[PDB]
Design a protein around this nucleic acid. Structure first.
Lengths: 150, 234
RNA sequence: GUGAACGGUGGAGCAACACCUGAAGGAAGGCUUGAUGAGCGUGUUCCCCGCAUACGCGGGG
């Protein structure tokens, strides 16, 4: 869908000087900004008041995601399922202010078997236990000599 | 070509001829060349030009508006706008609390195409009589009809010639009726007045695609309306 | 009658074997498609400009 979003200049939408009394310097500065944008309109410093379109996907359609692993430890799989439990807080898109990216996980397949419920993941208890033993004993030291350059 | 329309908002309605008088008075002291171009004066003296007015005032619900026909009038309007807007800003900030002056702009293109069927257009505040002979023609409908047809056709022709575009010369016009007859005044408190038609309806086989001005007193905001609104307005 | 005249550089031969371009990397962050144009006042001979050349036409405030 082509969804259209525009800007105004809201000082081109003031109208009443009682709204302008909040702006310091009086209405003369706002009128100077009016004269600035009309001088830009007759005439490359951009002002404001754009009109743009962006193509988005429609909402409510169902997608598939594939997260595969290459000889994983059970703690790594447990970390992936810990992320998949609370994926739904984050956003699978850009367009942060327009709420774009809200999603609900319909299912999660663990080598084909369905483990997803409404209250997170029901199943994969060995992976979760492995990752619970992995949060314990986790120090910043492993990250430090991972990031340290020779 | 194209005609540029500039809308000036002060929060209160002032009439187009009164705005013309008001605009001249505020800038009379400084920048006389800008005033000469805006009112279509001769470059030597105060007398206005005989030819088609490129820059004319018009009507705006919260103020007045400027019409600049062609590139020359658009440029005159383009350079005139900040000085005039600052003039209203200082004038309305001198007295009272102060009001935000609000501007708007449009660049309406002009077009015309000949069609083999009649089309209806209504014009309001239409001044038609300016000598005694036109008053003599208006007494009998048969000899006033052809005068009004020639006035409308010559108005369309002179506006097409002044804007620099070619108009087909096989156009036929027809006049149905006017709602009211009223006088206009050149200056307030003057005994002289000019007769005028109100809500006149005309039928042209061709179609018009922009702001078109017809008849006399074009610089006072008299007798022009947007045809682009009137296609299918009902 | 050229110190000439006459006279085959020939036969055979594998460039080929092996070898992962790619490991990591957020298209992002802000933004009224709603404004503008479509309705409201003047009551009779007076200043300038051209074609003419004044018998008048055109325009203009």
């Amino acid at each position: 869908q082509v969804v259209w979003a525009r800007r105004m200049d809201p000082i081109l939408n003031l109208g009443s000087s009682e709204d302008v009394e909040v702006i310091n310097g009086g209405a003369v500065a706002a009128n100077g900004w009016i004269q600035d944008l009309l001088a830009n309109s007759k005439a490359n410093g951009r002002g404001l008041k754009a009109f743009n379109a962006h193509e988005v996907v429609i909402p409510g359609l169902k997608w598939v995601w594939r997260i595969s692993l290459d000889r994983p430890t059970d703690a790594q799989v447990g970390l992936v399922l810990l992320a998949l439990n609370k994926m739904t807080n984050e956003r699978i898109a850009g367009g942060h202010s327009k709420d774009y990216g809200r999603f609900v996980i319909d299912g999660v397949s663990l080598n084909g078997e369905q483990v997803w419920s409404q209250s997170g993941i029901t199943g994969g208890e060995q992976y979760f236990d492995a990752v619970a033993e992995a949060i314990d004993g986790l120090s910043s030291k492993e990250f430090e000599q991972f990031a340290q350059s020779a | 070509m194209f005609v540029k329309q500039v809308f000036f908002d002060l929060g209160a309605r002032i009439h187009a001829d009164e705005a013309r008088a008001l605009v001249a008075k505020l800038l009379d002291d400084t920048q006389p060349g800008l005033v000469s171009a805006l009112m279509n004066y001769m470059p030597a003296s105060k007398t206005s030009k005989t030819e088609f007015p490129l820059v004319q005032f018009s009507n705006f619900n919260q103020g007045f508006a400027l019409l600049g026909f062609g590139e020359v009038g658009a440029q005159i309007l383009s350079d005139a706008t900040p000085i005039i807007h600052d003039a209203m800003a200082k004038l309305f900030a001198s007295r009272g609390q102060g009001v935000v002056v609000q501007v708007s702009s449009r660049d309406v293109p002009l077009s015309c195409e000949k069609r083999p069927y009649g089309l209806q257009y209504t014009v309001a505040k239409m001044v038609v009589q300016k000598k005694h002979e036109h008053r003599e023609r208006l007494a009998n409908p048969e000899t006033g009809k052809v005068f009004l047809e020639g006035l409308f056709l010559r108005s369309l022709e002179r506006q097409a010639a002044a804007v620099g575009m070619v108009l087909p010369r096989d156009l036929v016009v027809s006049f149905k009726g006017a709602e009211r007859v009223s006088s206009v005044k050149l200056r307030p408190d003057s005994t002289l007045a000019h007769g005028s038609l109100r809500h006149a309806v005309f039928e042209v086989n061709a179609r018009l695609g922009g702001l078109w001005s017809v008849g006399f007193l074009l610089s006072k905001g008299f007798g022009h309306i947007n045809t682009d609104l009137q296609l299918g307005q009902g």
